[PDB]
Design a protein around this ligand. Structure first.
Ligand code: NA
Length: 241
């Protein structure tokens, strides 16, 4: 398959972990690999994370580093890119002018909601004659049962049905963020979800790429690897197509 990728940072053993897990692509939330040496066959995808990365220098660096460009990360959240739709649209021509295959900003929430951030962005892009080649999404499930895969699927399908752009899933895991501090599944629940979700994602033609959040436990408790050693979730992700 071409779909399976990961987000990553340059922790000790990252090059080995990327190859071990079989990542076809990766990204780093930045315009370059952030110190990661990718294994052969693992494609880096640059990102323009927020307003401060919309510079001629960053855009040229991104275009030198890869072929596909991801736009702003969670502009809908104050603790992430924290950007209005208007600001994102006004910056958009600079990203579009790279000529790269271009992903929408990845909203944290509400991608299928009429009048939400993504909907207003896509509507304004269409009105302005802008190009948006694909839509990357984020999804963190708070229901840790076998039902989680179908919940994720329904969100992806809703966003595809609304805008008819191919979908990337650039962050996903089981994590309940409803509370003052994140709540996580058991290791077994997580590994089962990795298996079921990747099988689902591999069968949806409109999902081009997906990336578990994240490769390393140094990034998040939902990490797949500690150093070069996969946990049961990393083993399940490695086994996925
Ligand atoms: Na390029």
């Amino acid at each position: 398959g071409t779909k399976k990728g990961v987000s990553a940072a340059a922790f000790s053993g990252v090059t080995a972990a990327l190859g071990d897990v079989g990542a076809r692509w990766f990204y780093t939330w930045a315009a370059d690999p952030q110190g990661i040496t990718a294994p052969a066959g693992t494609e880096f995808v640059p990102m323009i994370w927020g307003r401060d990365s919309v510079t001629a220098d960053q855009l040229q660096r991104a275009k030198a580093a890869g072929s596909t460009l991801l736009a702003f990360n969670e502009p809908d959240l104050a603790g992430q890119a924290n950007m209005s739709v208007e600001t994102a649209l006004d910056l958009w021509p600079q990203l579009q002018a790279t000529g790269m295959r271009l992903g929408a900003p990845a909203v944290a929430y509400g991608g299928d909601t009429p009048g939400g951030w993504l909907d207003r962005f896509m509507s304004g892009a269409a009105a302005r004659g802008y190009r948006v080649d694909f839509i990357p999404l984020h999804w963190y499930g708070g229901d840790f049962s076998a039902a989680a895969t179908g919940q994720l699927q329904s969100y992806l399908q809703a966003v595809y049905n609304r805008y008819h752009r191919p979908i990337w899933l650039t962050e996903y895991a089981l994590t309940d963020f409803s509370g003052s501090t994140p709540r996580y599944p058991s290791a077994a629940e997580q590994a089962d979800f990795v298996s079921r979700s990747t099988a689902m994602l591999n069968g949806l033609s409109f999902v081009e790429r997906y990336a578990w959040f994240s490769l390393s436990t140094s990034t998040t408790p939902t990490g797949l690897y500690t150093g070069t050693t996969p946990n049961s979730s990393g083993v399940a992700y490695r086994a996925a197509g």
